[PDB]
Design a binder for this molecule. Structure first.
Ligand SMILES: N[C@@H](CCC(=O)O)C(=O)O
Lengths: 280, 285
């Protein structure tokens, strides 16, 4: 009861991957766990229906392990109000919002720990290292975020074409640290990671700035190993993915010790080889 | 109220420890970027040999962790006094009797000898049961330091996994690395070899590698990669075989713990941690 938790997540392979459930059996099998998604009936009503789906991935494997050792059950659902989390007119949306407004006890996914989020939710210890990296075609001369080509884009002709997926931790960091770069980049906003990789591969974009762990995963699976992260996998603003909990959550301590036990006992290494290993 | 008691440990490039000048002050020096090195007076034992009395002398401390301390103190508005951990160790929990006791900085923090540990202190389950760690101020891991010429593939090399007295490897006693090897049954063969050769400090182990008295030193990559970038007769091998972070240590009921963690996150995010890396950690090759 107090042991059965509402938990929110968000699709982002390979950390969280969503699949359609078997029409029959309507049962999740294999490495997957049940996760529901609220889907609107139409755009003229507030009516919707939870659709039963199945979730798997690195972070889902983490959740299963935490459920086993911290001893809780859960009702996993996919966020529909935004994505990871952004403060809009001083109100948090996304996974962060679900936790802040007490719709979820915790958020599990590719959720980046940062200062402004930590003001409104508590984060577990980081369990996946990440930060901001830059993906380019192999050989592209860029030192890092601080490269003049990004910092002062119009000092070059033609200027470097580079973008991120807006509204997440990466854009927030850039907007705060590099105001001119940021207002320049918005014209190259990408709707999502898949769009961005297509833009890079066909030469519509010179660089894609995004979450380090996801880019390292994409670099590992790239056809031809032609897209790479710069600086031999350099990372600005090193941080990690964390489990977000409500401020003052009584679950935080056990969750932290659990994650640290998984790391210390080498259980994280196998999840990494399992989900995050790539050919390139 | 009161000044915070900060405990730290000698561990270049995070904490350098040098004698004061005759007048009891610290010599003014400059970073590789030309800025003045911020130094603080830190008291510590001048005898560091095991089994010996630990009467302290004022000394001079500076480095990555001292710059971080100074930033924290200014940010959160506390004053402090720094001392070096008396037994010279990071801190493990050992059987006594049926008692268990924490030694090193862990022991000083838990006993009230210190109010905050500001050092390259590894976050692990064992310590986190007893103290509060901040979000990591440094992400790193473990690697292996050897003499240039020495060929081993890494942690899975047969000379480590099937050891003999022909090839000696070790770590630092009463460190997180000592714990890592004792904890994992899959590593017990390596642990039993290492417990015969472990060193009292990283500096002595590194020197022993240079002197060909130690063939491999397993330790923090942030430290070993720095040593290798400075001593061309030394190299790391195998890259990281395990990932870990350093965090600020405080008692579970410290009033400072929320804002220390927030300040750490802020510093990663605005490039301050990067500046410390450029200043202290990565400027040579
Ligand atoms: N992991 C990021 C999303 C991707 C990004 O913006 O880099 C977040 O939690 O916002």
């Amino acid at each position: 009861d107090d042991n059965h938790l509402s938990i929110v997540t968000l699709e982002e392979a390979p950390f969280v991957i969503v699949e359609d459930i078997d029409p029959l059996t309507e049962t999740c099998v294999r490495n997957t766990v049940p996760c529901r998604k609220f889907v609107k009936i139409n755009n003229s009503t507030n009516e919707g229906m939870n659709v039963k789906k199945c979730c798997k991935g690195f972070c889902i494997d983490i959740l299963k392990k935490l459920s086993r050792t911290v001893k809780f059950t859960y009702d996993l659902y996919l966020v529909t109000n935004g994505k990871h989390g952004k403060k809009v007119n001083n109100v948090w949306n996304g996974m962060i919002g679900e936790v802040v407004y007490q719709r979820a006890v915790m958020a599990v996914g590719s959720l980046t720990i940062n200062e402004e989020r930590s003001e409104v939710v508590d984060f577990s210890v980081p369990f996946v290292e990440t930060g901001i990296s830059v993906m380019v075609s192999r050989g592209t001369q860029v030192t890092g975020l601080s490269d003049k080509k990004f910092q002062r884009p119009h000092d070059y002709s033609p200027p470097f074409r580079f973008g991120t997926v807006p509204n997440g931790s990466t854009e927030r960091n850039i907007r705060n640290n590099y105001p001119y770069m940021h207002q320049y980049m918005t014209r190259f906003n990408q709707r999502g990671v898949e769009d961005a990789l297509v833009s890079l591969k066909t030469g519509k974009l010179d660089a894609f700035i995004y979450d380090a762990a996801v880019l390292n995963y994409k670099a590992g699976r790239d056809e031809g190993c032609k897209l790479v992260t710069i600086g031999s996998g350099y990372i600005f603003a090193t941080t990690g993915y964390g489990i977000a909990l409500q401020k003052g959550s009584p679950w935080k301590r056990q969750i932290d010790l659990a994650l640290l036990q998984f790391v210390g006992d080498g259980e994280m290494e196998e999840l990494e080889t399992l989900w995050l290993t790539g050919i390139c | 109220s009161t000044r915070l008691k900060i405990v730290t440990i000698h561990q270049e490039p995070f904490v350098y420890v040098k004698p004061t000048m005759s007048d009891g002050t610290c010599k003014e020096e400059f970073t590789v970027n030309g800025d003045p090195v911020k130094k603080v007076i830190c008291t510590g034992p001048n005898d560091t040999s095991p089994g010996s009395p630990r009467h302290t002398v004022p000394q001079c401390c500076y480095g990555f962790c001292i710059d971080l301390l100074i930033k924290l103190a200014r940010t959160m508005n506390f004053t402090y006094e720094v001392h070096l951990v008396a037994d010279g160790k990071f801190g493990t929990q050992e059987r006594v009797s049926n008692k268990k006791e924490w030694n090193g900085m862990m022991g000083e923090l838990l006993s009230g000898q210190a109010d905050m540990i500001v050092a390259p202190l590894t976050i692990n389950n064992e310590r986190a049961q007893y103290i509060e760690f901040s979000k990591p101020f440094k992400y790193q891991g473990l690697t292996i330091l050897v003499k240039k010429g020495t060929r081993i593939t890494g942690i899975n090399d047969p000379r480590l996994r099937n050891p003999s007295d022909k090839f000696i490897y070790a770590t630092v006693k009463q460190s997180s690395v000592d714990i890592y090897f004792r904890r994992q049954v899959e590593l017990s063969t390596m642990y039993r070899h290492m417990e015969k050769h472990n060193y009292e400090s990283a500096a002595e182990a590194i020197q022993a590698v240079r002197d060909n008295k130690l063939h491999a030193f397993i330790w923090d990559s942030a430290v070993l990669e720095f040593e290798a970038s400075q001593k061309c007769d030394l190299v790391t091998t195998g890259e990281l075989f395990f990932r870990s972070g350093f965090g600020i240590g405080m008692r579970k009921d410290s009033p400072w713990k929320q804002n220390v963690s927030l300040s750490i996150l802020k510093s990663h995010e605005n490039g301050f941690m990067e500046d410390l890396d450029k200043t202290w950690v990565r400027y040579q090759e």
